[PDB]
RNA sequence: AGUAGUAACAAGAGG
RNA sequence: ACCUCUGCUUCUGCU
């Protein structure tokens with residue numbers, strides 16, 4: 001659902017910074033993710049303590065509801081949940097938009113001498129828009 | 136006890152000097168022929184400009 | 185006209201065409217046969233650089249131990265190990281003063297780490313010297329062997345599961361009169377003497393480094409045993425925690441982050457300079473870094489960094505340096521000999537070198553053996569000086585950085601000053617001053633200070649120029665970092681993991697290089713085409729409509745003729761290549777999902793298939809790659825698990841050896857672990873905790889699972905009873 | 921012989 | 936002779 005505009009040619013400094021690399025994370029720490037994934041995939045092995053956060057709780061229910069009767073290996077389900085739920089970053093040379101949905105297609109939109117104007121399909125984050133509005 | 140039992144030869148290589156044939160080979164390597172030597176596999180269709 | 189590619193440099197700046205100077209389309213150099221020669225070389229050189237120091241005989245091992253610390257000062261520019269304790273201490277104090285609270289914090293974190301670290305952390309190493317066998321083994325196998333032999337000889341604090349308790353066992357094991365191990369003639373109990381055991385504990389095995397680029401000649405590397413590894417781990421963690429907060433440290437930051445840090449350092453420097461100052465940069469390397477590092481100095485560093493901290497922790501961290509001061513090197517595999525006259529050949533061992541007749545050897549090797557004889561002890565070579573390759577990368581980095589830290593204007597108060605960045609022995613030093621004479625003096629001050637702490641700048645490897653261009657570990661800066669695509673060429677190919685992992689790795693490599701190493705779009709397209717061909721030939725998964733003959737042709741042709749939507753077949757199933765620039769980041773299975781005959785898709789993605797060998801979340805979709813330069817890297821890849829996610833067969837050579845029994849032990853262990861996981865699925869995700877036996881946990885779980893299944897109606901009352909019955913019979917059978 | 925290149929291969933091990 | 940097994944496994948390290 002992406003849209004392509006023109007390619008332009010110019011020199012631009014691509015400055016190295018840390019950027020987000022996985023759109024759709026739920027901004028959990030690894031211990032909150034673990035806690036959640038334990039509840040979702042292996043509930044009876046949770047141990048003593050349980051989830052304070054309400055974010056944790058509504059994710060759990062959603063995921064728990066999405067993945068009932070699931071016969072894909074629990075290893076892959078936990079692996080994917082961990083990849084999805086935790087914010088991951090990387091240092092990349094990046095000239096333009098730093099949002100994760102743009103980072104994801106950096107190889108496509110940015111070259112040494114070119115920009116391929118592009119808009120990914122889907123909604124922006126309200127956070128990203130607010131941030132861009134200020135800039 | 137074998138008298139000539141000895142460590143394997145472990146010396147520097149024998150030296151050799153430049154000859155004209157290597158430059159000549161390289162000249163020929165950089166030249167056009169009238170054959171296409173490399174066949175490339177297919178790509179997905181081009182979409183982005 | 186004679187063609188000369190070098191003439192491009194008449195027009196194109198060397199950095200802008202640097203890619204062409206890296207010949208990484210050919211096989212890199214390999215050693216053949218023994219490394220014993222290279223081991224003797226490093227042992228000899230290491231002593232030579234420290235030769236004016238003091239010899240002692242070790243009370244416990246009998247090893248001859250050379251101590252060059254606080255020895256006579258260098259008198260020329262030859263590599264020196266005569267590091268001076270008081271100078272090191274001044275530098276470390278300087279680092280403490282520049283960074284108040286840094287030592288305390290890094291110590292605090294290291295303490296927490298010591299309390300929390302599990303024994304199984306040591307499973308993360310690669311090939312490890314295994315003293316119970318006097319042979320190398322995978323890290324986990326080496327750990328298990330140590331634990332097992334320890335417990336049989338009465339050391340088992342490590343049963344706690346805490347690394348620190350295993351460390352206690354290690355020190356306590358040295359009090360034993362005679363450590364019993366078993367060798368395989370069937371099975372024989374062998375008793376090591378206290379001295380034997382300690383020598384093995386203090387051993388680093390040695391071998392030669394293969395596949396290293398950029399060098400005519402080979403060199404030796406080393407692998408420590410399990411007695412050493414847990415202590416080194418914590419010293420290097422402490423040092424890492426410090427390095428992370430030093431602006432002058434190049435570790436542990438990696439590629440892009442390293443470049444960002446270097447660029448910041450230049451920017452910082454220039455802002456702090458006056459307009460009237462000259463600025464020069466040394467592209468810097470050190471001679472024989474590891475051979476001139478000294479365990480006694482590391483001991484000093486550790487005691488000074490941990491000043492004011494609890495004494496148990498200071499003493500725990502001091503262990504690694506002490507062990508290194510007392511280390512020995514196994515001398516490798518020995519040599520082979522040959523008789524022309526009798527057309528025969530034979531292997532002698534490294535141990536034979538103690539007393540073999542010298543007539544068998546070339547003059548060079550005879551001289552080496554003569555020199556090494558006074559160091560040999562129960563088959564090893566005493567090596568008190570040096571650290572050996574890469575053993576304390578981070579702590580050694582702290583030493584180099586401490587010299588960089590000295591260069592502040594307010595410390596020197598000279599007509600010059602310096603700053604820079606250091607990673608191990610590699611550095612960029614920026615020297616500023618009013619005139620060229622100031623620069624020279626500053627460079628001499630830096631160089632001579634380094635000498636005083638056993639750091640020896642390589643004169644032939646280093647050079648200087650006005651600031652603006654420089655090189656740092658194959659990153660080229662010309663008023664900003666330029667690309668070096670050729671460094672990455674070896675990574676363009678079929679990785680050899682499996683069909684699923686390799687497709688994802690191959691497309692990602694292309695994409696990453698477009699982003700990071702200026703791989704232009706046309707060449708990226710051609711990279712896709714070249715990869716697909718290599719994948720098809722490697723895996724014999726030519727497109728279903730082709731007429732090549734392989735062992736796979738007929739079965740792939742049937743799949744093809746029978747398929748309705750061929751565009752949905754994976755390449756490994758004889759399908760077409762879907763990739764272009766825009767979709768390199770999309771796993772093939774996703775990309776083709778909507779185009780797949782539903783039956784193929786349901787087979788391909790059948791979770792019940794017998795091909796996929798899942799193991800652990802933490803090692804899921806992980807490959808190991810060996811880059812052209814530097815250590816092995818773990819590589820994450822994005823892929824759907826399918827029947828293409830298979831595992832190639834294991835090596836079978838051990839079947840012909842006395843060690844074949846190990847295969848059986850592994851099979852048994854795996855069977856026990858597998859069944860355990862049928863009761864505790866979460867154990868594939870996180871590691872389970874407990875002092876309970878595997879059996880007890882499985883019994884408790886079966887019972888209470890069967891009860892909930894009963895109430896919830898997942899199971900009959902008959903089934904349920906048989907489960908609790910089976911449990912009771914297991915309970916009983918467990919009493920003989 | 922040839923590969924190679926500081927030490928190896930030119931099958932090893934076992935029966 | 937001939938038989939059997941093996942093709943990274945006595946040798947691939949460190950942050």
Ligand SMILES: Nc1nc2c(ncn2[C@@H]2O[C@H](COP(=O)(O)OP(=O)(O)OP(=O)(O)O)[C@@H](O)[C@H]2O)c(=O)[nH]1
Pocket residue numbers: 397398469574577608609610645656657658813814815949
């Ligand atoms: N600990 C450790 N350090 C390494 C390793 N590989 C390289 N280094 C260090 O990193 C430095 C940079 O390597 P490169 O510049 O890529 O290669 P090089 O051939 O040593 O360097 P040049 O002299 O620039 O040709 C080396 O000189 C070492 O100091 C490794 O596997 N382990």
Ligand SMILES: Nc1ccn([C@@H]2O[C@H](COP(=O)(O)OP(=O)(O)OP(=O)(O)O)[C@@H](O)[C@H]2O)c(=O)n1
Pocket residue numbers: 393469470471472473474475572573574575608609642645949
């Ligand atoms: N594969 C490698 C390469 C390097 N090193 C570490 O990096 C240091 C610097 O490497 P290098 O400059 O290549 O070698 P030196 O030991 O300094 O020797 P020289 O420069 O004189 O060749 C080594 O001493 C060692 O501690 C390592 O552990 N593993």
Ligand SMILES: [Mg+2]
Pocket residue numbers: 469470471472473609642
């Ligand atoms: Mg060096």
Ligand SMILES: [Mg+2]
Pocket residue numbers: 469470609610
């Ligand atoms: Mg170096």
